[PDB]
C-alpha cells in the first residue's frame, strides 16, 4: 500500500527521437524504469515539454478511463501541457465467488499512444517506450536491471548495429526485460543462457513444467522478462544476444552479454 | 458425458461471403459457437447448399479420419450434399502405464477445408469458421461469451477494417474467445484488462506460475480464451482491444468493450 | 551423467546444399539427432571438409565461450580444420541463494553459426541443423522420433515443398521434435493429435495448468516437442501436419503422420 509520486516529462532529443526522462533535459530511450510493488499506487505527474500532443499509456496495471493516455478517452496531453496520471496495482486474492483473482505482477511497459497517429505510431517509433516492473511479495531481486526493446528494426532506437552492451560480473544476478514494438515479429536469443517461459522467468521448483528457452517469438507489444545468473556453468565471456530472424541479425540486431570475472577480466573477443 | 445432435448449413451471404449457420437463412460470420462438455459427444448433420464442395474441420477435439473434412480421407460434401460428422470430446485421466492424458477442455474452431484449396485458403477468406468450447467439470461458467477473429485484416470479416464492440455491466463475468486465420500474424491487446497464458485464462490459484498478459502474439489457426470480471480495479468505461501491429491497429483493427455502470452509463462516451 | 565423445562432419551435399554427419560421405538434413541424460558432457570432434569457414553452435546446453562457433569468439573452424567442441548439461537443484536453477532438459537444436554471414545465414539455409534432445531423468521415452525443420520454405530441406510422412502403429509412443529457421514465422498443426505447451509436450498430471493445442506459432531459431499416443481416440489414418499460414499450405508445406491399425493396415488406403 505504498502511494508514490514521480515526475515524468517527455522530450524531443537533440537527435530528432523523443524521449520520457525523470527530470527536464534527461530524456533517454528506453525511458526510467518504474518499479512498484504489489499494491502500490503511483502518481505520474507527466509534463508534455513538445510542440505536438503526447500521451502515457501502461500495459498490465489497473488505471481509469481518464488514465487510459487515448485520445477517445480525452486522456492525452497538449503542448507544453500537464496531467498527472494514476496507475494501481494489486496483490492476488480469492474472490467472493471462490475464483481466484490474479494481481498485477509481471513485467509491463508504458508508451505514448497518441504521437502520429491514435495509437502512437510515430511517438513509439520515436522513443517514448519505458519499462515497468511490478513485484509480488517474495520476489527475488536482482543486482542490475537491463532492457532491450525490439523496436521495429532498431534495438533501444540505437543507430545500428543496434544493440547496447551490458556488463556483468560472473555470478551476479541480472534480469532483463523485453519489449517489442512496430510492426515486426522478432525472435529473442540470448548465447550461454536460458530462462522459464513463465511470469517470472524463473521456475518456482521441480514441479513447475514450464518451458525452459533460449529464444522467445515476440510481436509488437508484447513484454517478458526474466533473471539470470550471469556466467552460470558456462563462465565468463562476451555473450552475444540477437534477434534470430536471419535477416535481422545480418543487419545488426545484436548486443552483448559481458560477463566479467571476478578480477574484472574477460576471455579475449570480437 | 451426452450424446448431442445438430444441423449446420454452409451457405452463400451477399457480398462474396460463405457462412456456418443453426438454420437455413441464418448463417453468420463467425459461425455458430459450439459449446461442449468433456465427455460429450456431437453429431453435426452437415448441408451443403452452395455449389461448391465445402467441409467441417475442427481443432481439439477426437474425430475419425472419416470426420477430417478434407479431400484426402474423402470426408467433404458435394454441392447441395449431406453429411454427419461426429466430434467427440474426453476428460483427462491417468493412462494404464501411469502417465497422463490430456483432455479435450479448451478454446477450439472449427472451419473448412476444401473452398478455394485442399486447405480452405478461400472458404476460411469468405467466412467460414467458427468458435467451439469445451468445458471441464468444475469450470467457471461466464455470463455473456464473445468471438473475436482476425481473419486476414478484417475482424470477423467486417468491412472498413472495424472491429465489433461488445457491451458488459462493471463486474459481470465475460468470455473472449480469440481466433486468427489467414497469412498474417496479429498481437492481440485489450486496454483496462489482463488475462492468464494458460487454458481458461484464469490462474488456478495461489500455485500457477503462468505469465498473466494483456497482449498475446498469435498466428494462423490460433485459438486461446479467456474470461475477465468487467472493470474489475478499473471501472466503468470503453475499453479498447486492439490488434497492436502498428499498422494493423492504424487501418482501423479496433473494436470498443462498453462497461456499463449498473445505472447504464458510461463515463464521457 | 557419462562422458560421450563423437566426431561429426560438415559437407557439401549435392545441388548446393550442406549437411552435418556422423561419417564422412554420410552427412544428412537435418543432422544427426544427439540424445543426452541431464549431466551428461558431450565431446563433438568437429571436422570441417568444406572449403569455407564453418562452426557448430548449440541451443541450451552449457557451452563455454570457446565452444560458442562464433566468429566473435573466434571458435569456428577453418576449411579442412578440426575443432573439439565441448557441450555439457546439468540437472536442475536448489542454488545456495534458495532459487530453482533449471535443468538442462528438453527439445533443442544446433547449427552453423559462420557460413555465408556472422550469423550462419548460408549454412542454415543450406541444411547445417540438426536436432538435439536432453532427457531429465524419469522422462519417458518414445518407441520413435522424429525431427521437422521448418526452415524459409522448406520442410528438411526437401524439394517441392513438400514434407516427409512418418509412420507409426495405433498407440506407439511417438515423439516429434519441431525446430523453425530463416525469416519466416509459421503455425504447426496436426490433425488428429494435441499436446501439451509446456517442457515435455505432456501433461504432469492434474496440476499442470498448461494450454493443450495443436497449432502453435513458432519463429526463426525455435524449437519444441512433444510426444503423442498415435491415433489415440481417434484411430488409424492419414493424419496431415502442415503450417497453417495459409499460402504456406497451398505451397506444399505439408506432410502426413501415417497411422496404421495393428493388423498394418490404414483406413482409407
Ligand atoms: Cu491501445
Ligand atoms: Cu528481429
Ligand atoms: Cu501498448
Ligand atoms: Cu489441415
Ligand atoms: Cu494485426
Ligand atoms: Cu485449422
Ligand atoms: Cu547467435
Ligand atoms: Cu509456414
Ligand atoms: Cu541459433
Ligand atoms: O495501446
Ligand atoms: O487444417
Given at each position: 500500500g505504498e502511494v508514490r509520486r514521480i515526475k515524468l516529462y517527455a522530450e524531443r532529443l537533440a537527435?530528432?527521437?523523443?524521449?520520457?526522462?525523470?527530470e527536464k533535459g534527461r530524456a533517454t530511450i528506453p525511458g526510467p524504469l518504474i518499479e512498484l510493488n504489489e499494491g502500490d499506487t503511483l502518481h505520474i505527474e507527466f509534463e508534455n515539454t513538445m510542440d505536438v500532443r503526447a500521451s502515457l499509456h501502461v500495459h498490465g496495471l489497473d488505471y481509469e478511463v481518464s488514465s487510459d493516455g487515448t485520445t477517445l478517452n480525452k486522456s492525452d496531453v497538449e503542448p507544453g501541457g500537464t496531467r498527472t496520471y494514476t496507475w494501481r496495482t494489486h496483490a492476488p486474492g480469492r474472490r467472493s465467488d471462490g475464483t481466484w483473482r490474479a494481481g498485477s505482477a509481471g513485467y509491463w511497459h508504458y508508451h505514448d499512444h497518441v504521437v502520429g497517429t491514435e495509437?502512437?505510431?510515430?511517438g513509439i517509433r520515436k522513443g517514448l517506450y519505458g519499462p515497468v516492473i511490478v513485484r509480488r511479495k517474495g520476489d527475488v531481486l536482482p543486482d542490475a536491471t537491463h532492457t532491450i526493446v525490439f523496436n521495429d528494426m532498431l534495438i533501444n532506437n540505437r543507430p545500428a548495429h543496434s544493440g547496447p552492451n551490458f556488463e556483468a560480473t560472473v555470478g551476479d544476478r541480472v534480469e532483463f526485460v523485453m519489449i517489442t514494438h512496430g510492426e515486426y515479429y522478432h525472435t529473442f536469443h540470448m548465447h550461454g543462457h536460458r530462462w522459464a517461459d513463465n511470469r517470472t522467468g524463473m521456475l518456482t521448483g521441480p514441479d513447475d513444467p514450464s518451458q525452459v528457452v533460449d529464444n522467445k517469438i515476440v510481436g509488437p507489444a508484447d513484454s517478458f522478462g526474466f533473471?539470470?545468473?550471469?556466467?552460470?556453468?558456462?563462465?565468463?565471456?562476451?555473450?552475444?544476444?540477437?534477434?534470430?530472424?536471419?535477416?535481422?541479425?545480418?543487419?545488426?540486431?545484436?548486443?552483448?552479454?559481458?560477463?566479467?570475472?571476478?578480477?574484472?577480466?574477460?576471455?579475449?573477443?570480437?
Amino acid at each position: 500500500g505504498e502511494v508514490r509520486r514521480i515526475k515524468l516529462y517527455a522530450e524531443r532529443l537533440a537527435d530528432g527521437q523523443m524521449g520520457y526522462g525523470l527530470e527536464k533535459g534527461r530524456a533517454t530511450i528506453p525511458g526510467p524504469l518504474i518499479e512498484l510493488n504489489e499494491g502500490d499506487t503511483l502518481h505520474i505527474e507527466f509534463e508534455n515539454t513538445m510542440d505536438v500532443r503526447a500521451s502515457l499509456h501502461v500495459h498490465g496495471l489497473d488505471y481509469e478511463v481518464s488514465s487510459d493516455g487515448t485520445t477517445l478517452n480525452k486522456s492525452d496531453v497538449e503542448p507544453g501541457g500537464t496531467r498527472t496520471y494514476t496507475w494501481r496495482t494489486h496483490a492476488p486474492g480469492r474472490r467472493s465467488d471462490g475464483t481466484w483473482r490474479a494481481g498485477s505482477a509481471g513485467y509491463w511497459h508504458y508508451h505514448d499512444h497518441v504521437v502520429g497517429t491514435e495509437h502512437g505510431t510515430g511517438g513509439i517509433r520515436k522513443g517514448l517506450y519505458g519499462p515497468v516492473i511490478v513485484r509480488r511479495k517474495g520476489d527475488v531481486l536482482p543486482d542490475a536491471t537491463h532492457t532491450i526493446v525490439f523496436n521495429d528494426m532498431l534495438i533501444n532506437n540505437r543507430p545500428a548495429h543496434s544493440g547496447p552492451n551490458f556488463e556483468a560480473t560472473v555470478g551476479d544476478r541480472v534480469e532483463f526485460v523485453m519489449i517489442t514494438h512496430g510492426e515486426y515479429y522478432h525472435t529473442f536469443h540470448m548465447h550461454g543462457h536460458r530462462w522459464a517461459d513463465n511470469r517470472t522467468g524463473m521456475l518456482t521448483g521441480p514441479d513447475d513444467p514450464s518451458q525452459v528457452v533460449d529464444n522467445k517469438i515476440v510481436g509488437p507489444a508484447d513484454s517478458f522478462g526474466f533473471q539470470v545468473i550471469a556466467g552460470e556453468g558456462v563462465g565468463a565471456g562476451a555473450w552475444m544476444y540477437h534477434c534470430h530472424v536471419q535477416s535481422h541479425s545480418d543487419m545488426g540486431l545484436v548486443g552483448l552479454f559481458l560477463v566479467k570475472k571476478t578480477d574484472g577480466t574477460i576471455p579475449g573477443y570480437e
